[PDB]
Structure formats: structure tokens, C-alpha cells
Ligand SMILES: Nc1noc2ccccc12
């Protein structure tokens with residue numbers, strides 16, 4: 001069920017790790033800076049996400065997170081179906097790649113404003129989700145989920 | 151209007167500080183554990199919130215956060231109208247008080263599961279937002295915002 005499908009994405013900047021969850025149907029994102037991509041960090045991130053949006057399915061970003069007992073435990077706890085993240089459709093991967101580039105671009109544009117990377121990342125989340133493409137990703141996710149509920 | 155109104159709430163547990171944002175019309179929440187309630191922590195929390203939901207107005211939890219230049223800067227950045235949190239309607243306070251008690255109750259119920267308070271708090275957010283009262287707070291916020299957009 002497409003309203004409930006999210007994709008994990010891990011990208012790197014400034015020797016640091018940015019973990020992103022993308023709501024596939026809308027392009028809406030949540031993101032966090034973590035010191036490294038561990039099972040425990042990913043598990044906690046998913047718990048936060050699922051408390052905030054109705055997350056039914058997660059396409060994990062790599063095999064380590066797919067295998068992780070801690071990630072599996074979090075998915076069990078939160079009622080998430082954990083799936084692999086293989087682009088059986090190869091255009092999917094280029095979309096994520098483009099988003100990572102966009103996000104890094106925005107991060108660069110706010111570095112006269114933010115002392116810490118985590119602030120810049122949250123500014124990028126804001127700008128990304130409010131950007132009008134015409135509706136924004138934020139508007140799209142709410143519309144999609146509301147239509148599903150009704 | 152009412153779709154964009156949030157209330158800040160700071161509560162204490164285990165010598166630690168739990169910062170909560172409540173979407174007043176739905177009862178939907180986001181929350182975080184912070185070491186102490188500073189302007190910088192509150193500012194960052196609001197930035198995260200506003201990137202994720204269309205936050206128009208925030209009723210601040212106390213006068214220190216209302217006064218804080220850092221909080222004011224974050225509200226400016228994110229396009230949030232910063233307001234006081236005075237219960238001109240006195241029933242408002244008791245509602246928040248009840249929610250804090252409920253949240254602490256859930257936190258207690260999951261402490262055989264979570265090593266760290268932050269995990270327990272996010273479990274509480276999940277349980278709170280999914281609880282059916284009949285719709286859940288999560289369903290209500292999406293419906294309210296979607297209706298506003300349309
Ligand atoms: N969750 C949201 N509904 O509408 C939005 C507009 C901008 C950002 C987030 C949202």
C-alpha cells in the first residue's frame with residue numbers, strides 16, 4: 001500500500017552521516033545527523049519516524065540494516081514490514097541520488113547561517129518539504145495519507 | 151487558523167527534560183529528551199517540527215523561551231508566529247497536565263523494554279499518536295491539515 005511506503009537513504013558529508021527517510025509517493029523526508037550508521041541508530045530513527053507517520057513498509061538502505069537484529073526489533077515493535085531496497089526499477093536509484101545532491105546543495109547554501117551540521121540538515125529538510133513543484137512534498141504526503149484514511 | 155497551532159510543553163522525569171509539541175486541534179505530539187531546556191535546544195526542536203508539519207503559530211511554554219533571542223530567530227527562520235502560552239481558557243492547562251501524566255504512565259509501562267529514556271519517550275509518542283479515542287491523533291492531524299489545504 002503506497003501511502004505507507006518509505007525508503008531509507010544514508011548519505012555522507014563533512015566526515016558525518018546523514019540518515020534520511022523518504023516517503024516514496026510524495027518525496028517528503030525526515031532526516032538526522034548521526035555519528036555513524038549503526039543498527040542501534042537506524043532502529044531509533046525508525047521508531048521516531050513510525051511514531052510520527054503511518055509507516056507500513058520500509059525499504060532498507062543496505063544489507064547490514066536489513067540483517068540487523070536491532071533494526072528488525074524496532075520494525076517489529078513499530079509494526080513495520082522490513083524490506084530490501086533493491087531498485088528492481090533502476091530509475092528509483094537515480095531519484096535518490098538526485099535528492100542527496102539537492103540536499104547537499106541546500107546544506108551548502110545555509111552554511112553562513114548554521115554553526116552545526118545538524119541545524120543545516122534540518123534547514124534542508126524544511127526547504128525540501130516546503131518546495132513547490134504546484135504542490136509541496138508536505139502537502140502531497142498529507143493529501144495521500146488523508147485520502148487513504150477516508 | 152487552528153490547523154497551524156501548536157503548543158510547547160516541558161515536563162521532567164529521571165532528572166531529565168522532555169520537550170513536547172502538541173498540535174492543539176488533534177492532540178498529536180512530537181517529543182524529545184534534552185539535557186536541559188535552553189533557548190538553543192528549544193530553537194532546534196522548533197526547526198525540526200516546522201520542517202515536518204505546517205507550523206503557523208506556537209504557544210511557547212514559558213517566558214524564558216518567549217523572550218529567547220535564539221527561539222525568536224528560529225521562529226523567524228521557519229515562518230512561525232511566536233505567541234505566549236497563557237491559558238486565557240483555563241481548561242487548557244489541565245489538558246496538558248493530563249497529557250504529561252499519560253505520557254509518564256506509558257514511559258513507565260515500557261521501561262522493561264527500553265534501556266535509555268529517549269527510546270521510552272519515542273515509544274510513548276508512538277503509543278500516544280496511534281491510540282484510538284473513533285480516530286487516533288495521527289489520523290486527526292492529517293485530516294485537519296488535508297481539509298485546510300483543500
Ligand atoms: N506535514 C505537512 N503537511 O503540510 C506540510 C507543508 C510543509 C511541510 C510539511 C507539511
Ligand SMILES: Nc1noc2ccccc12
Nearest residue numbers: 052053054279288289292
Ligand atoms: N501522521 C500520521 N498520519 O496518520 C497517523 C497515524 C498514526 C500516527 C501518525 C500518523
